[PDB]
């Protein structure tokens, strides 16, 4: 759900941390819940 310029796996920088493969998503700025994003 968009509210403040992207929220989850949408407006975030999905073209570096993974770029589709590693999934740019990152629930909560304080790192993801040991899922979605990583490495």
UniProtKB/Swiss-Prot annotation:
A Gene Ontology cellular-component term: extracellular region
GO molecular function terms noted in the UniProt entry: hormone activity; toxin activity
A Pfam entry, by short name: ANP
Tissue expression as described in the entry: Expressed by the venom gland.
Compartments, as annotated in UniProt: Secreted
Annotated keywords: Disulfide bond, Hypotensive agent, Secreted, Toxin, Vasoactive, Vasodilator
GO biological processes: regulation of blood pressure; vasodilation
UniProt keyword 4Fe-4S present: no
Protein family (similarity comment): Belongs to the natriuretic peptide family.
Protein name (database record): Natriuretic peptide TNPc
Organism: Oxyuranus microlepidotus
């Amino acid at each position: 759900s968009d509210s403040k310029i992207g929220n989850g796996c949408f407006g975030f920088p999905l073209d570096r941390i993974g770029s589709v493969s590693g999934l740019g998503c990152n629930r909560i700025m304080q790192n993801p819940p040991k899922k979605f994003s990583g490495e």
